[PDB]
Design a protein around this ligand. Structure first.
Ligand code: ATP
Ligand code: ATP
Ligand SMILES: OC[C@H]1O[C@H](O[C@H]2[C@H](O)[C@@H](O)[C@@H](O)O[C@@H]2CO)[C@H](O)[C@@H](O)[C@@H]1O
Lengths: 490, 372, 370, 284, 371
């Protein structure tokens, strides 16, 4: 080791060999991004001593690449109508439309017959009972061959499926023509027919139907190939393409009396749900973490692992069996509660106790996260501080509220406001137990009592008919992020 | 509370930091612990507190056995050799913590803080968080925390170690005043000899874990139990000379110095169980050494080091055939250059004598300050 | 880019994928063109993503309902089976696989709910829904129950709801009518009124889900349940002497369960549409072809008339075909999204007693429209 | 009331607590040992079958194992293992800069990092598939259908951890690094040789949290991995889920198996979770 | 390795604990800092070390400006008033951390670590980590860490504050032996007056962020520049009596004692800027007070405190018309009861005098050992 200018030169080589290579073959976004990241990358390790940035940058690269990018992308799509309908790009939609086949002639069931070193095509009319043979021909490129109404069989055995498949390329380029006059192309591995393109695109850009004579032009205000008549044109064609929509579907959220109806009420629930999740999760987490390092508490190593297992097993399966346990008439939770106690709680039917069902499950689901966090975080407090506590006459409850707790809230604050945001949009937990069940009653748009902001949104974007509207969904995700963002700063 | 320790032993597996120590600290006494750095003063102190376990033996604090008692319930407060200040709390909050836990009432709490912060001179640092203080300022905050609490027993681990000469005296007076006002049992660790002598009713000298000697300040100074106690107490160290027991009498032991001076000297010494011809050690303090023209027993040598302290001059003297230099203390500034010829008188009345094993032969010479 | 000289096939995990690869090898041995059959997780969601770019499999196997969406997005190529070929399959299966009048996929398997009964607990199953309360009465004394099925999910409750005159969307001739919804009408109201009555008289429990219902039948706690072909292997492991028969009738009319036809659709981006249609028509949809996949994992009822008659030798497959025949084709339109949530909630509210049968279905229709 | 009165009522209050939280998990075990596929039944299975665990492992119940579930597991430990290390390294080094080094716009970046990670995880896979499709053609082994790509995708989730490990860093007394500086340490040498070994417990926290996050990860891993043999357990078991029924026994056996590497990793990390690492050292 | 400070000012916003201080430490000097708890001794060191930024002014090491230089590139080593020991590392690894970090010469590393550990009595504790050591042991580890490095500039912040008398002397000798062996610049903060008097080529007295006075050990003892310095150097504090000026000469000042007798005494002292009748402060050290039988000027009072120290007895006498008690030092053990009437001698040629601004009236009496 002596000089890094040998390394930065060699790395200055690849950045260019890859960059200019990305500039070609039409990958400009990936050419621009790879330049700036390598520019900021090489700059910090070189002449200008940005020593502090040498530690931040490799972290911000991955975070920029895999977190920041997915955001800029999802806000970008929020300004467009990208959805089930309007899924394809314009070129893709046009490509699909120019591929649309239309059968005008008759199917003929072809055969391939070897004639020495050459081949011979045969066609049999399903109706009329007519049979046709062509002259001897060789494969390769576009060619028309005249068919004659034969009455006898061709010499040489019919070719296998293998042979007609191996020659499918050349066989598709031959356009057979009958003794009467009509053209017939290959439509399948077994048949020749008068299948023709349904559309042909003019140099102007205007599509035109080859069967009905109806003309079509792109309508980039809606993202469809609209009909035209000498402007519109009351007929649109599927697929449909993605096109810039602007502040639309952002404004649509602030308009609909019905979509906006139960918004304020579910918002109250989302705040509360995540708040008292964060509280209980931290409370249970911290207390358990303290008890675990009590060093007088024997077997703590076994306690330690067992309290963690609700996190060791994937959420999906756990939430689902919780749905089984909390069953209002069946389920083991109400078996014991009718056995020792009198009341048999209605965990699904009644809203307020359903809200309770969700908080205890999430507490079970999330407490090991906080206690793992606290387990190490607690080690930051030096032992002699508790020795000072003892000499002032304190502990263990006095110790907790005067030393340990108020010496963790500061490092723990960012972790629980982030946990507030996580549980603000804890989609998975809700849908698996209750789709917001029970019903809100009177809501013109699918809304229930247990529904978060995200669950209600998901159903009004993806469900509720009208296909899966990704554009709308992306717009709402931006709004609630801005809502929770402005909320979390305060 | 009358804290006492019976055959208390502490072991770190193999490392024996304390060896069946016996101490009986009476209610209201002021006892100071002294010993070399690394002997186990903090260990003994922390074992009393309950911040360290007791491997063997019994610890009593009052009418209770405290071995298996959590420290908080022992009714003790300790000011640490570190400081262990609460970093998240201000000076005011640090000091008002013991009684903020035990008792109540804002007004009583604040009035007692300002009063104690006054004497420690922390009154202007009341809103300061600990990391914004000075080393010595923190030390006083740790004192404040214990003094404001007023526990049954006061434990103090080197509480003046990082304070200026003048402030050390002021605090020493303030500690002394609290002891007579409260009458609370106080155990005090210090390396400062002045603090040890002037504060204690009783001093405990510790040696490699084991207790070397227990007694009143002047009792230990004049009459040490062995060579160790003699060497450990005294501003500069007591001088030690190799001697030969030439003769033994009823109350006096004759010894001779191993140089060309050839002077035999009888010493008012225990005389019981002394071997003639056996190599013993003669102990004389630099403060006791007289100027040469005064005394009869003369020791001449070469000056090695001259330390000018202002109030006094300390002179190191290499005696012709001796292994270690002889320190001598004389009042005021004395002009002596290095390598000069110097002589001092050796007074037999103020001489200590130690056997082969180290144990001292009792000085029969009646000294002021000590009764019987 | 989808590859040239090959066929990539997507199928679900619960289908006989190893058997389908045996049909592919038989195809290759004849064609030279190799067939790769894959079974990825959530292929029904993966396909719209990969296909939109012009990729994914050449041919995808999934239920017809999801295919009306793919067609609308322009992901599926229009198929052209000849008049002679269409006669090899049951004519109603073709109604499932047509978006915009044009055909978009090849029907493979037919799937629908049937009455599963314990032979020991009930040797003769009822033909009618009206005689269930009478049957439960005589079974409750022996500590058992007559019928126990999933009441939570509208898919299971629909047979009885749709029997008297209920329907998702009215079918004109080749296209559904999104305006015309039959959840708020006499037929649907009468179905749900009877369902609630079965709960009122304590014959059925309001919050019985799939797993609670299935466990009871396998243990022999309930005399009969209503489930699909997928559940048969579980009852086979229980060694319960069971029978699969036609669903009971309500108000003289047969139960109309939703019909799920497994469909084979070709990618519109595929350059091998001709290679695929040959493989599907002449290799898979033959007795030998369907046998290879069925011998791997049972398909149940099939659309191929020929092989169906062979499978219907087992009464279970005959029953599920019969119920599907009398059943209702699950609409392939995206408006089914609204239907599933609204009817779920409608049945939930009426079984819970939160809403009356009339207003529970009236709101459910208003949920679907506008 | 007293000292030992606290101790044993904690054992009871904790045994009761663990019993309550373990019960749902024992049900998962129960349904993996139950014959056939039933989500609900008796706590001690009505009819016990090993077939699910026989198929989870290499064994054949006529009839051979359908899926390489042990390879699911090994791919899971592979991906989640070196993913966590990567997450640790990137978030650890990044925190040291935010905690010990003053540079323009540090507080606004940490504000950003957190908020920029508080975005709804929807429409994200659309972007991720496009990126790794672009990556694969230039740098393979980190593109589509490869572990490298899957682990590289998880490296974006450091923001949460950076804040965390930064917070722990600042608990360490400022003097230990000043002493290093006066001994002649480069910021790197102070970071590696002095700070890290004292920050070790919070490093184990980050490691285990990330290790579990990746073990239980489905959407991205399922979106990236094609080859059956390349599946992680979290993806490989998603085959057991069908629109009409789940293969609960095989699914629960997989669900339990996935907890094993977590438990092993959690147990080993205890070596690093130790009090009084900073004891001695700084007086105050 | 010379270190100098030019108008160096340190402020924590509003709190200024170092106001434009000027110091001139030459190569190979042993300079010790003394000052009250809180004065800003550690800060000075930390600024020199570069762990604290200079708010205003210039700092030079060698002869180069060092204000912007990182701590690593200053040739400065520091044994902290804390200890700043690496808790995760052993005594050996603490003492060997410096040189093994760049210039890792294992033969030399192990040789001098063992060497320095030997003189600090740490040979046996070599495997221990700080938490398994004593507060005094950790102190010697902190010194050892710096002694093994042997930097160009030595900063020592109160490095003997937690050691027994006999060991404190042993370490004092070890510092003094090393200084003369290397000839390096050492800045040494201590509260122990003995340490300051015995180690220093030069002593710096600090007061509330200001340099009060700089000079030789005996220079500051015999001739303090003001009231503060006089009251700060000297085992027990110098005694302070209020006096009234009666007459003035060039060479001397005649003052009147405040008690009934109104004794008038001539003091060999400055007289510069001294008016008759102006209130001065008379300074006399406990050590200099004479027995009654010798001296001409006699002060009689009442014994309040008697403190036995073994080597000497300290008697506190409350003399009428003085608010402060007079502390007197006498050789050997003296038996006096609290309340007994005691008389001492007040030697005129050993008296200090201070104006109302507290500035010392320069003593014109020559005292041995001051050039
Ligand atoms: N954890 C431990 N393991 C092994 N030995 C220890 C441990 N802690 C302390 N020691 C040893 O025991 C002795 C403890 O001394 P302690 O700190 O109790 O008081 P001290 O040494 O008198 O204090 P000082 O050194 O400040 O005068 C030391 O010699 C030390 O080497
Ligand atoms: N961060 C800070 N903010 C405000 N004031 C401070 C801060 N740090 C120190 N001080 C004050 O400035 C002074 C700094 O003194 P420093 O600790 O540097 O040496 P010192 O006080 O002479 O040492 P000691 O008192 O331990 O002998 C202290 O009196 C303290 O009150
Ligand atoms: O709050 C309940 C919630 O806790 C856990 O979620 C964690 C997540 O796993 C971490 O990666 C990180 O993002 O913090 C979250 C806490 O807000 C559980 O994973 C989850 O199942 C549970 O619902």
């Amino acid at each position: 080791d002596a000089l890094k200018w040998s390394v930065l030169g060699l790395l200055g080589l690849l950045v260019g060999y890859l960059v200019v290579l990305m500039y070609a073959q039409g990958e400009y976004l990936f050419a621009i991004t790879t330049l700036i990241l390598s520019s900021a990358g090489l700059y910090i390790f070189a002449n200008r001593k940005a020593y502090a940035w040498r530690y931040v940058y490799p972290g911000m690269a991955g975070m920029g690449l895999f977190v920041l990018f997915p955001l800029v992308c999802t806000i970008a799509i929020a300004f467009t109508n990208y959805s089930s309908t309007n899924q394809l790009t314009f070129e893709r939609a046009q490509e699909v439309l120019l591929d649309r086949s239309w059968q005008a002639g008759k199917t003929y069931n072809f055969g391939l017959y070897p004639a020495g070193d050459e081949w011979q095509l045969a066609l049999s009319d399903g109706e009329t009972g007519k049979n046709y043979l062509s002259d001897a021909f060789k494969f390769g490129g576009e060619q028309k061959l005249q068919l004659k109404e034969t009455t006898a069989q061709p010499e040489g055995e019919r070719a296998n499926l293998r042979v007609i498949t191996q020659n499918r390329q050349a066989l598709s380029d031959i356009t057979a023509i009958l003794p009467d006059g009509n053209k017939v192309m290959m439509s399948s591995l077994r048949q020749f027919s008068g299948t023709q393109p349904l559309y042909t695109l003019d140099g102007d850009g205007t599509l035109t139907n080859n069967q009905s004579g109806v003309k079509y032009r792109p309508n980039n205000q809606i993202g469809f190939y609209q009909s035209i008549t000498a402007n519109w044109g009351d007929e649109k064609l599927s697929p449909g393409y993605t096109v810039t929509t602007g502040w639309k579907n952002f404004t649509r959220v602030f308009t609909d009396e019905g979509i906006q109806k139960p918004f304020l009420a579910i918002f109250v629930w989302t705040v509360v749900f995540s708040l008292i999740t964060v509280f209980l999760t931290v409370a249970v987490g911290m207390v358990l973490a303290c008890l675990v390092q009590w060093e007088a508490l024997r077997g703590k190593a076994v306690y330690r692992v067992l309290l963690i297992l609700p996190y060791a097993v994937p959420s999906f399966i756990s939430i689902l069996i919780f749905k089984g346990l909390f069953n209002q008439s069946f389920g083991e939770i109400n078996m014991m509660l009718s056995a020792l106690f009198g009341v048999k709680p209605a965990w699904f039917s009644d809203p307020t106790t359903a809200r309770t069902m969700l908080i205890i499950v999430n507490t079970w689901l999330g407490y090991p996260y906080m206690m793992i966090l606290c387990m190490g975080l607690l080690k930051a407090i030096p032992d002699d501080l508790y020795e000072a506590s003892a000499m002032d006459g304190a502990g263990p409850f006095q110790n907790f509220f005067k030393i340990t707790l108020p010496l963790l809230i500061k490092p723990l604050t960012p972790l629980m406001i982030a946990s507030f945001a996580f549980n603000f949009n804890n989609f998975v937990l809700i849908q698996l137990l209750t789709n917001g069940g029970p019903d809100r009653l009177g809501t013109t748009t699918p809304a229930g009592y247990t529904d978060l902001l995200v669950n209600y949104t998901y159903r009004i974007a993806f469900e509720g008919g009208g296909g899966q509207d990704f554009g709308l969904a992306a717009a709402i995700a931006t709004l609630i992020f801005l809502l929770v963002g402005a909320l979390a700063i305060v | 509370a009358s804290v006492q320790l019976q055959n208390v032993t502490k072991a770190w597996g193999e490392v024996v930091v304390s060896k069946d120590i016996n101490l009986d600290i009476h209610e209201g006494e002021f006892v100071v612990f002294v010993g070399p750095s690394g002997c186990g003063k903090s260990t003994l102190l922390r074992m009393i507190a309950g911040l360290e376990t007791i491997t063997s033996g019994d610890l009593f604090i009052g009418e209770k056995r405290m071995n298996d008692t959590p420290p908080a319930e022992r009714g003790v407060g300790m000011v640490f050799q570190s400081y262990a200040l609460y970093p998240h709390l201000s000076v005011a909050e640090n000091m008002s913590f013991g009684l903020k836990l035990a008792g109540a009432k804002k007004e009583v709490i604040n009035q007692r803080v300002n009063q104690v912060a006054e004497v420690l001179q922390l009154a202007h640092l009341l809103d300061r968080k600990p990391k914004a203080l000075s080393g010595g300022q923190r030390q006083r905050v740790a004192i404040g925390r214990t003094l404001v609490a007023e526990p049954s027993v006061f434990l103090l681990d080197q509480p003046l170690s990082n304070l200026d000469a003048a402030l050390r005296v002021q605090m020493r007076i303030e500690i002394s005043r609290l002891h007579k006002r409260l009458g609370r049992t106080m155990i005090y660790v210090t390396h400062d000899q002045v603090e040890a002598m002037t504060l204690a009713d009783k001093i405990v000298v510790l040696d490699a874990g084991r207790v070397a000697q227990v007694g009143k300040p002047l009792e230990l100074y004049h009459y040490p139990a062995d060579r160790f106690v003699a060497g450990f107490i005294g501003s500069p160290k007591m001088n030690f000379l190799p001697v030969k027991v030439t003769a033994t009498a009823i109350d006096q032991v004759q010894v001779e110095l191993p140089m060309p001076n050839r002077q035999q000297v009888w010493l008012p010494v225990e005389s019981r169980d002394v071997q003639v011809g056996a190599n013993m050690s003669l102990g004389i303090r630099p403060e006791h050494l007289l100027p040469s023209d005064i005394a009869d027993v003369i020791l001449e040598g070469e000056v090695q080091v001259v330390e000018q302290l202002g109030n006094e001059t300390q002179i190191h003297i290499q005696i012709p055939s001796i292994r270690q230099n002889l320190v001598y203390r004389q009042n005021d500034v004395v002009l002596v250059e290095e390598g000069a010829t110097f002589a001092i008188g050796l007074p037999p009345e103020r001489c200590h004598l130690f056997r082969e094993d180290g144990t001292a032969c009792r000085r029969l010479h009646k000294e002021p300050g000590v009764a019987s | 880019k989808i590859e040239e000289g090959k066929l990539v096939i997507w199928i679900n995990g619960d289908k006989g994928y190893n058997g389908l690869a045996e049909v592919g090898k038989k195809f290759e041995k004849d064609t030279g063109i190799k067939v790769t059959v894959e079974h990825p997780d959530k292929l029904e969601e993966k396909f719209p993503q990969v296909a939109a770019t012009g990729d994914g499999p050449d041919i995808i196997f999934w239920a017809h309902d999801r295919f009306g969406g793919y067609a609308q997005s322009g992901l599926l190529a229009e198929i052209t089976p000849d008049k002679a070929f269409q006669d090899k399959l049951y004519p109603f299966t073709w109604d499932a696989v047509r978006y915009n009048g044009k055909l978009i996929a090849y029907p493979i398997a037919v799937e629908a709910l049937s009455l599963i009964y314990n032979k020991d607990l009930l040797p003769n199953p009822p033909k009618t829904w009206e005689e269930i309360p009478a049957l439960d009465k005589e079974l409750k004394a022996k500590g058992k129950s007559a019928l126990m099925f999933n009441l939570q999910e509208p898919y299971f409750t629909w047979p009885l709801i749709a029997a008297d005159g209920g329907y998702a969307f009215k079918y004109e001739n080749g296209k559904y009518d999104i305006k015309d919804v039959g959840v708020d009408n006499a037929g649907a109201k009468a179905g749900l009124t009877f369902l609630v009555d079965l709960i009122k008289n304590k014959h059925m429990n309001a919050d019985t889900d799939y797993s609670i219902a299935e466990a009871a039948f396998n243990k022999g706690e309930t005399a009969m349940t209503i489930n699909g072909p997928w559940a048969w292997s579980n009852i086979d492991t229980s060694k319960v002497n069971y029978g699969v028969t036609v669903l009971p009738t309500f108000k003289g009319q047969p139960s109309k369960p939703f019909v799920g036809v497994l469909s084979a659709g070709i990618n519109a981006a595929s350059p091998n549409k001709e290679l695929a249609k040959e493989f599907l028509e002449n290799y898979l949809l033959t007795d030998e072809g369907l046998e290879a996949v069925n011998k791997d994992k049972p398909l149940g009822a099939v659309a191929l008339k020929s092989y169906e008659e062979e499978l219907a030798k087992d009464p279970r497959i005959a029953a599920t075909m019969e119920n599907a025949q009398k059943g209702e084709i699950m609409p392939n339109i995206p408006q089914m999204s609204a239907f599933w949530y609204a009817v779920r909630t409608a049945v939930i509210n009426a079984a819970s007693g939160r809403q009356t049968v009339d207003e529970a279905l009236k709101d459910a229709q208003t949920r679907i429209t506008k | 009331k007293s000292q030992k009165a606290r101790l044993f009522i904690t054992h009871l209050l904790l045994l009761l607590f663990i019993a309550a939280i373990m019960f749902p998990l024992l049900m998962v075990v129960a349904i993996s040992l139950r014959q056939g596929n039933f989500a609900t039944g008796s706590l001690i299975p009505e009819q016990i079958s090993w077939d699910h665990w026989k198929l989870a492992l290499g064994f054949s119940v006529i009839t051979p194992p359908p899926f390489p579930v042990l390879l699911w597991l090994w791919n899971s430990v592979k991906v989640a293992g070196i993913s966590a290390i990567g997450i640790v390294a990137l978030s650890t080094t990044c925190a040291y800069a935010f905690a010990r080094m003053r540079f323009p716009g540090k507080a606004t970046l940490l504000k950003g990092m957190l908020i920029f990670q508080m975005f709804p995880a929807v429409l994200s896979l659309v972007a991720l598939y496009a990126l790794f499709d672009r990556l694969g053609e230039y740098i393979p082994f980190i593109g589509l259908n490869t572990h490298g790509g899957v682990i590289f995708a998880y490296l974006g989730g450091i923001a949460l951890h950076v804040w965390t490990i930064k917070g722990y860093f600042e608990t360490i007394d400022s003097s230990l690094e000043e002493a290093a500086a006066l001994d002649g340490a480069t910021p790197w040498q102070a970071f590696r040789l002095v700070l890290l070994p004292l920050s070790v417990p919070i490093l184990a926290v980050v490691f285990i949290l990330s290790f579990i996050a990746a073990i239980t990860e489905v959407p991205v891993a399922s979106l990236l991995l094609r080859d059956v043999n390349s599946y992680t357990l979290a993806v490989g078991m998603q085959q057991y889920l069908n629109p009409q029924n789940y293969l609960w026994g095989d699914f629960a056996a997989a669900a339990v198996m996935s907890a094993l590497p977590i438990t092993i990793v959690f147990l080993l990390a205890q070596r690093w979770l130790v009090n009084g690492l900073t004891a001695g050292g700084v007086k105050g």
